[PDB]
Amino acid sequence: LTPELITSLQELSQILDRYDTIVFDLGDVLLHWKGIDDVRKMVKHPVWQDLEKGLINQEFALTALSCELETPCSKLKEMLELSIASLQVNPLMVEVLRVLHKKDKQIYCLSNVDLESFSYLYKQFDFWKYFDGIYVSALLQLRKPNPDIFQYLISSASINTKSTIFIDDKSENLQEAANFGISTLKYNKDNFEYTAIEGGWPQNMTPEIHKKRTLGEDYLNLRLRKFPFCKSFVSNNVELIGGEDFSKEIFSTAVILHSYTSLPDDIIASMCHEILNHDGQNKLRWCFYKNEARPDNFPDDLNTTSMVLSFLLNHNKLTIEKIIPVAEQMIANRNEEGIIQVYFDDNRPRIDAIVAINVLYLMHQIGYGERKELKETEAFVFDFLISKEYLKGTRYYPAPDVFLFFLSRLVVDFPDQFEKFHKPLTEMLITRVNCSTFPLERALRIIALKKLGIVNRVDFLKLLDTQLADGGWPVYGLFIAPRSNTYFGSRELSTAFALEALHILS
């Protein structure tokens, strides 16, 4: 066909408004800017593709290019970083972005950025909030102009090829996008090349993925149907190697109900029954143990309580009227720095950032969101993130991704009261993509990032591998009794989170 050179902003505004979904490229669209003096030679080398698909980090790609390009490793690095910093926002396109966002459009970002750079550009600029989904190559292990990434974007976002227009400066990228029935709009610094394209007619793993998802579902269903009081094993390592059956704590049952939403109704009913008949429930405060295992003077905790109450309220098993009293006791549990503490016992003073997150969640869920007493507790969690002190884990949660996950719930479900948490949190999660092997830690990152509007397909892929032949994933130690260093876990907890990660990316 033949493009339609556009030079009138009025024409552009009318052309864009004819589409429900707009897809932006990053380079030259939204952002413009010893040996080899041209960085163009690095980006044109085949090894750069391995960097864009996340297969290797910049450090790897640099040393590999030092050899191929016959340039000192230090120089290629200094030039690459200088190129990154010099990136500037394109004011025209950023405004075209904010506009299409206030007009309630579907706006996705499809760029070929390496993970480390994308993590930097996410912290540098602020137009990221205008996107509904972010599809970066380093998090997909795909890259333009391979048709795979386009098919994945279409099926991932449920995009309709018609009413969808793609903006990019590369002809090959637009060329491929058009083969799927997407209208193209090439960005030249002077003008635009508009090419309307008829769309409507309808990835490459739905056959394999649907099978593993079914297998995993069947496994977890059987377990919880046989043990609605979620089982738990105990050891001294996060892998629960040589662990012994315990199954005398109620928190695991909560976590499952609070995280995996696709549970069949009969399991949810049966598991909910356990959360109610729990003999550790005095009033509407819960104890971690059953009475049969309660170690004598072991008090009730705000973590099991915050979850059980938050869940029951969200499922119409309690009224805010019944809960606010309990919530007020928690307000009275503040330590000398104004931080809500973990136990209903002034003689067991202990604080935990994740416990504070689940308490703060209940507060904002019941209307307590703006109580002046939560100030210190909220700042405690914010500093725990900003100071990167979450890498040392919480008192009872040693895995850093656990804190980021539960924080993402509070930040996504109450965005008005936690807007300053968004970008700092998403930066951390991006830098931690594929940084561990335990499937549960992967599922967490997969879920949290998606809720934050970023698709993490790397951890998703390597999650499918760690599934065992009976559908379930390996046991994992989610929380610990610190003084004795005792991990609690179960294959249910792991399979639950893994299944949700699969569902949230379907």
Ligand X SMILES: CC1=CC[C@H]2C(C)(C)CCC[C@]2(C)[C@H]1COP(=O)(O)O
Ligand Y SMILES: CC(C)=CCC/C(C)=C/CC/C(C)=C\COP(=O)(O)OP(=O)(O)O
Nearer to Cl ion among residue 219 and residue 396 (C-beta):
396
> Is residue 25 part of the contact set for Ca ion (CB under 5 A)?
yes
Please state, in angstroms and as integers, the Cα–Cα distance from residue 326 to each residue in 285, 290, 294, 307, 501, following that order.
Answer: 7, 20, 21, 13, 33
Residues with Cβ < 8 Å from 478, sequence gap 6 or more? 252, 255, 397, 399, 402, 440, 487, 488, 489, 493
> Is residue 63 part of the contact set for its own copies (CB under 8 A)?
yes
Nearer to Cl ion among residue 138 and residue 326 (C-beta):
326
> Is residue 427 part of the contact set for Ca ion (CB under 5 A)?
no
Residue showing tokens 């416990």: 355
> Is residue 172 part of the contact set for its own copies (CB under 8 A)?
no
Please state, in angstroms and as integers, the Cα–Cα distance from residue 290 to each residue in 228, 256, 274, 493, following that order.
Answer: 15, 18, 11, 19
Q: Is 489 annotated as a binding residue?
A: no
Q: CA 169 to CA 111: how far, in whole Å?
A: 12
Residues 351 to 410 in contact with Ca ion, rule: CB under 5 A: none
Q: CA 301 to CA 232: how far, in whole Å?
A: 19
> Is residue 481 part of the contact set for ligand Y (CB under 6 A)?
yes
> Is residue 318 part of the contact set for Cl ion (CB under 5 A)?
no
Q: Is 169 annotated as a binding residue?
A: yes
Q: For its own copies, which residue of 82, 320, 391, 468 counts as binding (CB under 8 A)?
A: 468
> Is residue 350 part of the contact set for ligand Y (CB under 6 A)?
yes
Q: CA 36 to CA 136: how far, in whole Å?
A: 28
Question: What is the closest distance, in whole angstroms, from the C-beta atom of residue 299 to ligand Y in the complex?
Answer: 9
Are 358 and 397 a contacting pair, CB within 8 Å? no
Nearer to its own copies among residue 241 and residue 276 (C-beta):
241
Q: CA 52 to CA 57: how far, in whole Å?
A: 9
Helix (H, G, I), strand (E, B) or coil at 405: helix
Nearer to Ca ion among residue 170 and residue 317 (C-beta):
170
Q: In the numeric block, which tokens belong to residue 292?
A: 């049969």
Question: What is the closest distance, in whole angstroms, from the C-beta atom of residue 232 to its own copies in the complex?
Answer: 10
**Partner touching 60 among ligand Y, ligand X, Cl ion, none, CB below 5 to 8 Å by kind:** none
User: How many C-beta atoms surround the C-beta of residue 342 within 10 A?
Assistant: 22
Strands (E), 54-129: 88-89, 106-111
Question: What is the closest distance, in whole angstroms, from the C-beta atom of residue 160 to ligand X in the complex?
Answer: 23
Q: CA 496 to CA 267: how far, in whole Å?
A: 13
Helix (H, G, I), strand (E, B) or coil at 289: strand
Quick note: the x/- pattern for its own copies over 201-240, rule CB under 8 A, is ------------------------------x-x-----xx
Region binding its own copies by CB under 8 A among candidate stretches 45-53, 110-118, 205-213, 353-361? 45-53
Quick note: the x/- pattern for Ca ion over 161-180, rule CB under 5 A, is --------xx----------
Question: What is the closest distance, in whole angstroms, from the C-beta atom of residue 145 to Ca ion in the complex?
Answer: 10
Please state, in angstroms and as integers, the Cα–Cα distance from residue 348 to each residue in 34, 298, 342, 485, following that order.
Answer: 63, 9, 8, 18
Binding site for Ca ion (CB under 5 A): 25, 27-28, 169-170
Residues of each annotated binding site: 25, 27, 169
Binding site for Cl ion (CB under 5 A): 88-89, 350-353, 394-395
Binding site for ligand Y (CB under 6 A): 251, 288, 301, 303-304, 342, 348, 350, 355, 396, 479, 481-484
Residues of each annotated binding site for Mg(2+): 25, 27, 169
